């Protein structure tokens, strides 16, 4: 009524507002003496304002709730500012661009949360230069607009939207720690012409509430988005490290144990194809004309488009996960073309309100019988660590119901760029299954060229003329009849002494002659071994070993006889039961199976495979992996009728034995056996040591050990017409070595493998003798008085190589 | 003037016009800096005004920049002149290893006090358990807590009290909530006037929380946030580094490590490798059995594994970067000297230590590490887990950057990346095993090709060096070589090497072997090449050798398919297409079609899931033909390439995989409509010239000819003379049989008549079917391309007549 | 019914080709004898 | 200092330490032979 009077007169209100007003007031008021405050009202409206923001503060203290708390503020704003409605645009981030959406409209001093909260289908979505709200985010600055026609930034989409006009906006972003939250804005001051200094001054300091809490809300967002992105990255390490695995069933399990972080109802993770080229059988049709040239899309690393299976987990009602092989094109993820086109491209496409999308074929309706429209879309491309598209994974429908915005955008593609990395172990799958595949042919091919074959074996068990049966065919009874005529007596062949030559008899007699050792020792009948199998496992040993000067089959018979004549010649055998000389014996033939001719220390040098496999002891292992591997075989398994326990003795025996063939491991363990020999003289009879060694184990094991450096260096041994040609044969093998080491490793041999210096070779094998036979062959001598034959003629060649070098000497001398 | 007395008669009016023109600026006026204007110097009832006052003053800190420690200090302060107390205090909650403590932030807050005489450092806080005190019975009870008098509390203890001099009364304190868990805990002590505190102060503090919990809010969520972001930054970094490329332990523990040193927050951190030997080998046991030496008496790993920190890696970061690498560390390294890292070994149990030196359990060390004055604190050390949950790691992280002890954010932040390492321990596993697997595939090779390979002695059957020299065959000139091969080698004319009806039934294998190298030198490719005489020569033996000894694909088999390929490209002129290379390459694709063929087809392959089926896919003998032959012609003494150009020997090496490749029916079958195209244009040509003019320029048509040639070859037994086919037929009949025998013994499955052995009577019809289907096709149209291959069609005519009558025969007889 | 006037769509002012995120590249005695 | 406690955190009751546990419980043709 009076107002226009008050407008004119400024002083006059403020005069009549500054009286003390009486105890009396209007309505409660919560007048606890509040009349007089430096003015009439001031109490009054500062009672009115505490107890409105102490509401709002408790509304934020518990089941925080910025949509009802915010709209409190803003209806109260309204009426501070008079402005006629005020509105929130929350920002939000997609594809890297930013765009600001409405949440609540329209908000007015009589208004309430349903008519003003807008639900996520009716957004106005704001890219950040298309209005004042874009610019005041893109500025990150507040803006005041007196008038709006004027204003070069302003669209008329919003307000002829919603028919309506207007004519002044406030707007101001709501920063978090340099990150935009949302702007609130407010338009069409009702009473003046535009909004003044002072109402923009409150619109600053009162929105620090409203900052709290979006500032609150924004922060529970994105710590609920971070502890969501540490579980998938955390499920998949767990579930890709499982174990090695193809693409398929490393990312089926990766991303089916991830559905519950994901929040989307449906998404299928469609795998590209790897094939470069083609074959030139594919080729042929393309270039004689055929068939017409692939002119599809393209992967950027040149490559044919082609999904060969689609993954589709559904979450949306029921879980029913399905894999389809070779899927369609009119499959439903594939039909929309957005799995194409992400691959053509390697983008990664946020699509929001897909039905209303024009580029990619969205589908118009419903796609199942369960009314399920497609509305929000994230795809994105699978890269491994070579930049290629091994995959395109799609996203539907986040179950919010809100779009994917910047934070599922980023969870989504640490999970894809996780997965991308883990293909190498895929690769990594695939190579080992191929260098597995590649050595087992490998392993075949070996066995074939070694094992006996069919015509080979009837040359020591002929069945075909004897009896004109296949051996596989005759019983056990006949060919021990077929053996028994066959095989040498054990007086043909002096294989029960300690003077053995092998330069009169052939390599089929040595065979021979390694079936009699396995007869005589009684191995044949308690342990059952099928004799063709002991014939062919036999006759295989003997392929196994190559043809080379001195490491060839003869050296494994040599080795294997003097051990067969140790074990009942000397009498050592009391310690031993006859399981255990079964195996014993054995390891004298696999004693040097396959040696290349080589020495250790040549391995290393050339950095053979068998260097890098073994390390210590690198053929000593090596013929023992490979006298086992031809033991597995079941055609060559003598160790075939033996129990479990009795198999794991024997193949543990095996092991120590041809290992301790190795010369540097006896020099560090040779003073042990020193020990044992010595333990001997403390016992009063050989009775009585018998039953005290033939318990003990290690001990055992400690005097087997040097049993085989004994039979591998046995040749000494020999009488001295024997002991003259064998030296002759290793000093020729090392000379080899020599001449390969100064071919191909440029290195100059030492004088002991050296050709040149062959004149010195009696002194050597002095030198040889005097430091390594020496000493194994006096302490067997001295624990068993039987093998005082081996240390005499030790001597007695060590007396003839002596004058060799000494005539050499004297020779040198003489022409010096 | 009058207008007063309009406003007084309706001060609802008035109010209306207040809050139209002065509520905005008396609301700006409270928002601004100001201070609060309540006297605190009394203790007075709080009226509305104050009420209100004291409200705005608490809304004022509401800021974006909103430091919790201050923000709560001055509601501290209003607390304590609001509940009249003498002083308060605030203790954070944290989580050390599962047991929960409180540890003090702001003490001894009185009205008079500022934050400097109030904030409390990390090295002056007062840790207190859950179970005791009055504030450890708040924290447990989630719920406020009022004590009339502490003598009369259960829970009340004097630690504090006596550390700090002061008497407390009356303890009053309330949990702040955020959500369920327990943030932080302000608590009262005495009450200046009155008995005890009584439910109005017990309701102001509730009601003055609000504040507090908001503040506080804000402060847990930033922080929970920080740490999630870390989180998940350290898993995705370390996945980064981990997945780049497959090497061993210690380079992959490295990287991951030294790339999440940003987000790791640790002065220094260091990460001891426990060794993964179990078990040690029988010579290094002899000893501890022997009482050469004493069993292991020191730490052990649950697995019961000695415990060895052969490898220490440490990270400096407080200073300048020094990360070291110490092999072998010895017990005085400063990570190993406290016995924590080695305790962690012995049990396996994450370790939070707060104020290491104050601990008696460990010896660390009290004194500056380093010259800067560097002083162990805080220390966190985890094991690495392992998917086996054999502990191969400690990792021991020192002094957080902050100051602040460990706590369960950061907890959880490291547990995360020690499973993620422990997980990754698959990637080292598989590269020693994928190396070891390479260098024993190697091995078998190597052996392999040994055994395929002519040896020195054997190559002197044909190139008789010695007996006409005396020197070895790699010592002789190219000319000698020469002449011994003239003389060796046989004549063409007289053995008809170049013609259709070729037997090699009178011939010997070595027979067969010289006229291969005969055929390479009517080919004139020797001379023009420079092709090695000596490793041609010794190429053919070595294909002799690796072809197996099975009926009918054995070497004499390999040879034929050779002859006919020579006699084709002699006699029947189809070498004016081909260039001599071409020739060169597609004879040595004959000779090794078949090499090492084990006697069993495709289908046998697939069904028995041999390993050639796995590695090869679509052509599974073909392939590894291919690749065996390509694998032979790689080694330098066999390699009759060496001589050519690198484009040279690259297009020798396609052709032949062509070749090989396509010898398969299966291709034959679809890619043979071609070939009938291709004589089709030959037809329409009008002279030979031209034609072949065209021919010798387009590829394509060249490479499906020469498939049809391999066809061609391989099914020449077919078109041989009568008295060749009839025993030819019954080797494949044979080798059928064998295949049929072993898939009835192997797979349980019914062999099909062609294979049947039973079916030996059905053999003649089997050949007409397959001479109708196959063969008729290729050398009827061979015919028609070239006059000179109709002696080929007069062949297969007679033979399919002769199969047709034999199999009337046998029809006649079954009539019956 | 919504008081921004629209239904069953977040309806943009923007016309255009629509752009994609790039991915993100940023790394994130006895030697005598041979013995 | 307002704590009166200069060197470091203290604690009112001081037994042998107490470590967390690993966690653990999260985680024609075919005639033919063609
Ligand atoms: N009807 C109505 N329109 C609004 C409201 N808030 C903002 N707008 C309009 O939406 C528009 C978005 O772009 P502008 O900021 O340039 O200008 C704005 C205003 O014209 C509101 O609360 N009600
Ligand atoms: N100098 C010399 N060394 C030998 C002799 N006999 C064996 N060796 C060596 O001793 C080693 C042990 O047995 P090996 O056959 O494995 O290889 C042998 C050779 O290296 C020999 O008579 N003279
Ligand atoms: N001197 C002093 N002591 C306090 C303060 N706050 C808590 N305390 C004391 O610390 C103690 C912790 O255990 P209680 O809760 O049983 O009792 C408490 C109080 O006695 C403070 O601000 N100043
Ligand atoms: N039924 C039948 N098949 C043959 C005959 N000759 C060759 N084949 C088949 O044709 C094939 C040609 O390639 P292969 O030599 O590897 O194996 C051969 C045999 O499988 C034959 O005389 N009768
Ligand atoms: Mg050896
Ligand atoms: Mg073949
Ligand atoms: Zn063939």
Request: glycine fraction near 4%; aromatic fraction near 10%.
């Amino acid at each position: 009524q009076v107002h226009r009077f008050l407008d004119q007169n400024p002083g006059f209100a403020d005069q009549y507002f500054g009286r003390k007003l009486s105890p009396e007031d209007v309505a409660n008021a919560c007048e606890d003496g509040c009349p007089e405050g430096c003015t009439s009202f001031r109490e009054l409206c500062q009672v009115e304002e505490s107890a409105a923001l102490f509401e709002l503060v408790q509304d934020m203290q518990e089941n925080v709730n910025m949509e009802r708390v915010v709209f409190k503020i803003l209806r109260r704003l309204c009426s501070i500012l008079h402005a006629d409605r005020c509105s929130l645009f929350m920002y939000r981030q997609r594809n890297g661009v930013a765009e600001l959406a409405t949440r609540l409209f329209s908000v007015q001093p009589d208004s309430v949360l349903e008519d003003c909260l807008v639900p996520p289908d009716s957004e106005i979505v704001f890219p950040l230069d298309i209005g004042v709200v874009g610019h005041v985010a893109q500025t990150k600055k507040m803006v005041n607009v007196q008038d709006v026609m004027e204003c070069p930034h302003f669209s008329s989409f919003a307000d002829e939207l919603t028919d309506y006009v207007t004519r002044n906006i406030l707007a101001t972003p709501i920063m978090n720690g340099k990150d935009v939250v949302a702007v609130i804005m407010a338009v069409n001051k009702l009473d003046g012409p535009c909004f003044t200094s002072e109402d923009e001054d409150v619109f600053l300091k009162y929105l620090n509430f409203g900052t709290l809490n979006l500032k609150i809300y924004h922060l529970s967002y994105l710590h609920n988005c971070e502890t969501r992105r540490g579980q998938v990255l955390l499920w998949s390490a767990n579930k890709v490290f499982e174990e090695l695995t193809d693409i398929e069933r490393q990312f089926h399990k990766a991303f089916y144990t991830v559905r519950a972080y994901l929040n989307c109802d449906r998404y299928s993770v469609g795998l590209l194809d790897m094939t470069k080229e083609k074959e030139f059988f594919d080729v042929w049709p393309v270039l004689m004309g055929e068939a017409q040239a692939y002119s599809g899309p393209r992967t950027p690393d040149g490559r044919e488009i082609l999904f060969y299976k689609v993954i589709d987990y559904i979450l949306h009602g029921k879980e029913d996960i399905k894999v389809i092989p070779s899927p369609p094109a009119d499959h439903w993820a594939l039909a929309s073309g957005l799995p194409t086109y992400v691959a053509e491209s390697g983008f990664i496409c946020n699509i929001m309100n897909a039905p209303a999308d024009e580029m990619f074929n969205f589908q118009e309706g419903p796609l199942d019988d369960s009314g399920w429209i497609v509305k929000n879309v994230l795809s994105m491309p699978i890269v491994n660590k070579k930049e290629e598209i091994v995959g395109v994974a799609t996203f539907y429908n986040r179950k919010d119901g809100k779009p994917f915005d910047e934070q599922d955008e980023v969870l989504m593609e640490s999970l894809t760029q996780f997965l991308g990395w883990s293909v190498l172990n895929t690769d990594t799958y695939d190579k080992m299954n191929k260098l597995e595949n590649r050595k087992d042919i490998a392993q075949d091919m070996v066995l074939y060229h070694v094992r006996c074959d069919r015509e080979e074996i009837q040359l020591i068990l002929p069945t075909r003329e004897r009896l004109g049966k296949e051996p596989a065919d005759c019983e056990e009874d006949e060919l021990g009849k077929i053996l028994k005529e066959v095989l040498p007596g054990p007086a043909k062949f002096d294989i029960y002494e300690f003077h053995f030559s092998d330069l009169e008899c052939t390599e089929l007699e040595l065979v021979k002659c390694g079936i009699q050792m396995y007869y005589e020792l009684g191995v044949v009948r308690k342990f059952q071994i099928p004799q063709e199998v002991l014939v062919r496992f036999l006759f295989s040993v003997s392929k196994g070993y190559r043809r080379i000067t001195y490491h060839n089959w003869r050296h494994g018979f040599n080795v294997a006889q003097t051990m067969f004549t140790l074990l009942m010649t000397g009498k050592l055998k009391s310690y031993y039961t006859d399981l255990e000389a079964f195996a014993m014996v054995t390891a004298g033939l696999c004693h040097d199976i396959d040696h290349r001719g080589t020495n250790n220390l040549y391995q290393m040098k050339s950095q053979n495979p068998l260097a890098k496999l073994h390390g210590s002891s690198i053929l000593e292992r090596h013929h023992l992996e490979f006298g086992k591997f031809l033991l597995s075989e079941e055609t060559l398994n003598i160790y075939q009728n033996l129990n479990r326990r009795q198999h794991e003795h024997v193949i543990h025996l095996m092991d120590i034995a041809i290992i301790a063939t190795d010369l540097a491991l006896y020099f560090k363990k040779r003073t042990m056996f020193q020990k044992i020999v010595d333990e001997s003289k403390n016992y009063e009879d050989r009775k009585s040591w018998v039953e005290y060694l033939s318990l003990e184990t290690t001990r055992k094991e400690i005097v087997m050990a040097m049993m085989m450096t004994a039979c591998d260096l046995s040749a000494i041994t020999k009488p001295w017409e024997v002991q003259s040609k064998v030296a002759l044969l290793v000093a020729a093998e090392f000379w080899e070595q020599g001449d390969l080491e100064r071919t191909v490793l440029d290195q100059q041999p030492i004088p002991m493998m050296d050709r040149n210096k062959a004149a010195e070779l009696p002194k050597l094998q002095v030198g040889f003798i005097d430091f390594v036979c020496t000493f194994v062959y006096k302490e067997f001598s001295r624990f068993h008085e039987e093998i005082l034959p081996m240390f005499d003629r030790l001597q007695n060649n060590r007396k003839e190589w002596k004058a060799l070098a000494d005539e050499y000497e004297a020779k040198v001398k003489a022409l010096e | 003037e009058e207008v007063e007395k309009f406003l007084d008669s309706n001060v609802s009016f008035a109010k209306q016009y207040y809050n139209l023109r002065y509520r905005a600026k008396v609301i700006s006026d409270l928002l601004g800096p100001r201070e609060a204007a309540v006297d605190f110097s009394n203790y007075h009832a709080l009226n509305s005004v104050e009420e209100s006052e004291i409200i705005f003053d608490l809304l004022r800190d509401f800021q974006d920049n909103l430091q919790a420690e201050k923000c709560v200090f001055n509601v501290m302060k209003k607390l304590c002149f609001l509940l009249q107390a003498d002083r308060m205090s605030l203790f954070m909650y944290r989580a050390r290893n599962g047991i929960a403590e409180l540890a003090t932030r702001l003490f001894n807050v009185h009205k008079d006090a500022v934050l400097e005489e109030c904030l409390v450092a990390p090295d002056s806080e007062i840790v207190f358990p859950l179970d005791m005190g009055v504030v450890g019975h708040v924290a447990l009870s989630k719920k406020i807590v009022n004590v009339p008098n502490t003598e009369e509390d259960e829970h009340f203890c004097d630690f504090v009290d006596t550390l700090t001099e002061y008497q407390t009364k009356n303890i009053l304190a309330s949990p702040i909530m955020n959500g369920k868990d327990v943030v932080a805990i302000i608590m009262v002590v005495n009450k200046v006037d009155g008995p005890h505190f009584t439910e109005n102060d017990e309701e102001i503090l509730l009601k003055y929380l609000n504040f507090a919990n908001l503040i506080m809010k804000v402060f847990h969520l930033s922080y929970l946030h920080n740490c999630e972001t870390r989180r998940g930054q350290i898993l995705l970094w370390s996945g980064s580094k981990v997945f780049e490329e497959l090497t061993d332990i210690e380079r992959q523990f490295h990287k991951a490590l030294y790339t999440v040193r940003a987000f790791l927050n640790c002065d220094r951190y260091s990460v001891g490798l426990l060794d993964m030997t179990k078990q040690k080998e029988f010579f290094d046991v002899w000893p501890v059995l022997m009482g050469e030496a004493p069993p292991y008496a020191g730490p052990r790993t649950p697995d019961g594994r000695e415990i060895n920190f052969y490898k220490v890696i440490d990270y400096i970061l407080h200073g300048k970067e020094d990360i070291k690498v110490i092999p072998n560390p010895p017990p005085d390294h400063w990570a190993l000297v406290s016995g924590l890292p080695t305790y962690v070994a012995q049990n396996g149990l994450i370790c939070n230590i707060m104020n290491a030196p104050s601990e008696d359990f460990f010896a660390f060390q009290k004194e500056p590490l380093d010259e800067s004055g560097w002083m162990i604190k805080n220390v966190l050390s985890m094991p690495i887990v392992n998917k086996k949950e054999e502990i191969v790691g400690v990792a021991t992280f020192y002094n957080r950057k902050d100051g602040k002890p460990f706590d369960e954010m950061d907890e959880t932040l490291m547990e995360s990346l020690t499973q993620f390492l422990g997980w990754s321990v698959l990637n080292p596993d598989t590269y020693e095993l994928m190396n070891k697997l390479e260098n024993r595939k190697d091995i078998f090779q190597d052996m392999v090709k040994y055994h395929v390979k002519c040896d020195n002695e054997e190559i002197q059957t044909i190139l008789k060096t010695r007996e006409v020299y005396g020197k070895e065959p790699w010592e002789c000139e190219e000319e000698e070589l020469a002449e011994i091969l003239q003389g060796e080698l046989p004549d063409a004319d007289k053995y008809e090497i170049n013609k259709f009806h070729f037997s090699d039934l009178p011939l010997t294998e070595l027979e067969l072997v010289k006229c291969g190298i005969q055929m390479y030198y009517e080919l004139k490719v020797v001379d023009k090449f420079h092709i090695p005489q000596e490793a041609l020569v010794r190429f053919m033996y070595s294909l002799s050798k690796g072809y197996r000894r099975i009926t009918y694909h054995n070497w004499r088999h390999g040879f034929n398919v050779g002859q006919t390929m020579f006699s084709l490209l002699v006699t029947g002129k189809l070498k004016r297409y081909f260039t001599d290379l071409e020739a060169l390459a597609m004879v040595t694709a004959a000779f090794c079609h078949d090499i090492d063929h084990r006697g069993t087809n495709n289908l046998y392959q697939m069904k028995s899931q041999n390993p050639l089926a796995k590695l090869h896919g679509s052509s599974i003998l073909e392939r590894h033909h291919l690749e065996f032959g390509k694998t032979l012609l790689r080694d330098e003494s066999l390699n009759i390439f060496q001589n050519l150009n690198r484009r040279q020997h690259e297009h020798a090496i396609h052709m032949m995989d062509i070749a090989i490749i396509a010898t398969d029916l299966a291709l034959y079958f679809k890619k043979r409509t071609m070939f009938q195209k291709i004589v089709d244009q030959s037809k329409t040509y009008e002279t030979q010239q031209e034609w072949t003019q065209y021919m010798m320029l387009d590829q394509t048509r060249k490479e499906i000819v020469m498939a049809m040639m391999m066809t061609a070859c391989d099914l020449s037994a077919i078109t041989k003379p009568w008295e060749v086919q009839s025993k030819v037929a019954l080797l494949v009949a044979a080798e059928f049989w064998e295949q049929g025998d072993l898939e009835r013994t192997v797979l349980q499955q019914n062999p099909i008549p062609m294979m049947d052995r039973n079916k030996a009577d059905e053999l003649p019809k089997l050949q007409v079917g397959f001479i109708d289907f196959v063969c008729t096709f290729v050398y009827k149209e061979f015919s028609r391309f070239h006059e000179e291959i109709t002696p080929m069609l007069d062949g297969i005519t007679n033979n399919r007549k002769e199969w047709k009558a034999l199999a009337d025969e046998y029809e006649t007889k079954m009539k019956g | 019914r919504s008081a921004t006037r629209v239904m069953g769509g977040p309806v943009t002012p923007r016309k255009g080709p629509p752009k994609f995120k790039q991915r993100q590249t940023r790394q994130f005695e006895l030697a005598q004898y041979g013995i």
